[PDB]
Amino acid sequence: MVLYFIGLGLYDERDITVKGLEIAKKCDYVFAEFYTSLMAGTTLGRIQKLIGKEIRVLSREDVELNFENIVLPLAKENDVAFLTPGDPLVATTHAELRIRAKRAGVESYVIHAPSIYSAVGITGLHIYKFGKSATVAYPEGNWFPTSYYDVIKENAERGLHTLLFLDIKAEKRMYMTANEAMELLLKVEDMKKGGVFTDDTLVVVLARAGSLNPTIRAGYVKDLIREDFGDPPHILIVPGKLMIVEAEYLVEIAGAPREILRVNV
Amino acid sequence: MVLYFIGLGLYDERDITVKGLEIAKKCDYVFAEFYTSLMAGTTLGRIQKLIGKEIRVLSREDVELNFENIVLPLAKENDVAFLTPGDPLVATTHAELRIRAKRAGVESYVIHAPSIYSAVGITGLHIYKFGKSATVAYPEGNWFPTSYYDVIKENAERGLHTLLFLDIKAEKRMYMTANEAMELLLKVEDMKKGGVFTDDTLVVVLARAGSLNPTIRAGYVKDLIREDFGDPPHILIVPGKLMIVEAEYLVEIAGAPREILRVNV
Ligand SMILES: Nc1ncnc2c1ncn2[C@@H]1O[C@H](CSCC[C@H](N)C(=O)O)[C@@H](O)[C@H]1O
Ligand SMILES: [Pt+2]
After folding, report:
1. Residue ranges per domain, chain B?
2. Which amino acids does the record list as binding S-adenosyl-L-methionine (chains A, B)?
3. Half-sphere exposure of residue B77, counting CA atoms within 13 Å on the CB side?
4. Candidates B16, B119, B249; nearest CB to A95
5. What is the dihedral sign for C-alpha B138, A123, B208, B245?
6. Contact residues for B73 (Cβ-Cβ < 8 A; gap 6+)
7. How far is CA B52 from the centre of its chain?
8. A114, A220, B103, B230: which one has the fewest Cβ atoms less than 10 Å from its Cβ?
9. Which CATH superfamily is domain A1-114 in?
């Protein structure tokens, strides 16, 4: 009669919370999805070893369309767990699954876990200064998305930082890199000429948040566009006007140019 | 040799990640501060038991003035852990402590944990639609803080949601309730008369996130200002323009008035 939405955390199998692991252990059935994001710091096997249960993976369609024919039925007579990377209900569509539960007579509880939304705090930028978020999507065919460009403009216009998730083809295991993201934005700046993203724009790159050795780099596009940030996942951030304390962090912890202390404050 | 910043989580001692626990367990000295947030589902005793180490708790002064005198010295000879509620670098000024660590020749590592900043997802509001954040501070003496009010206005103008952290006076054991935040906002509305916060405004209240049964309620200020949401911590949210699915979630899961279902696009 109970369904648990349990977050798996940021990077590896140790990133799940104690509460999430003990509840998952007492569940009769354990499902998981890996299309909204991947756990690049681990594998399905390791997660199964840690949980001690057989984990049935669900595709985007299993979740979006048939969640009620796959997960809810069993949750009607047993205790089920639905594992997701990061924090549950950050994925725009997951919240609705709680409504599907209710109409099926199934109760549901949420067990939180670290999300990249809070972890960006490791970049030293204040959390209250992050504005609207966006996702940089790969262009394809005759389609060239650019709304993420306008999000940056509106945020920075108000002195706000912009958090940009990079594109991901989970099934294919293809991660967009900060580098490609920077290439797209430059390609967009060229077409919209709004003066939002150029070689002189200051940006921050966070890679493998959750790991003990994340890559935190800050600098101007012209310098980082071809820098190696390591393995995925990559998160890109275009900060607004910096607070002096913010800039000092980037310089001392993220290897930012001393220049940002007078140019971006 | 090293300093670890380990987040404790939202509600109780189980909200710590597994990675966080296994690391804390192997540390020589464990410190912690419980003034930046409130973990209402546990005690220091339960945390000490889980970690199997004694925990010396620090005050805001110990930390803000003597972190490098109390904690750092030990980090040069041992593995030291500094524990905090939620995520260590979210809505705190601890990020700067990593610079003090650097200037003392101490490598530091961050272990994240569930944060109220990402747990807002349980309210059904799309987390990418949250704009600038703010804190509703306690007026004291003749000083009456009001800046969080302009933050709401600016967000609402863009259709973005506003996350409001509520003030906390740990040493006086004071934890601002959503009710108190609403009272203060109304008073600020009288002064500025900008039409940003009134009896007819729709608000959302999340109390004790992280617990299995948090209180999630959405409705008009005139109806909620006097409602009892349970023990703190409280967070107050002022939604921007609602998308249909956000509205349905608020109606289905947060007991919101069924009229918010009809959206004005
Ligand atoms: N579990 C919880 N439920 C409701 N609100 C909470 C909460 N935890 C913290 N808060 C809100 O957040 C404020 C503290 S700000 C610091 C919180 C911590 N850095 C984190 O990442 O969550 C509290 O005063 C309250 O306004
Ligand atoms: Pt600041």
Report:
1. 1-114, 115-265
2. 10, 87, 90, 115-116, 166, 209, 234
3. 4
4. B249
5. positive
6. none
7. 27
8. B103
9. Tetrapyrrole methylase, N-terminal domain (3.40.1010.10)
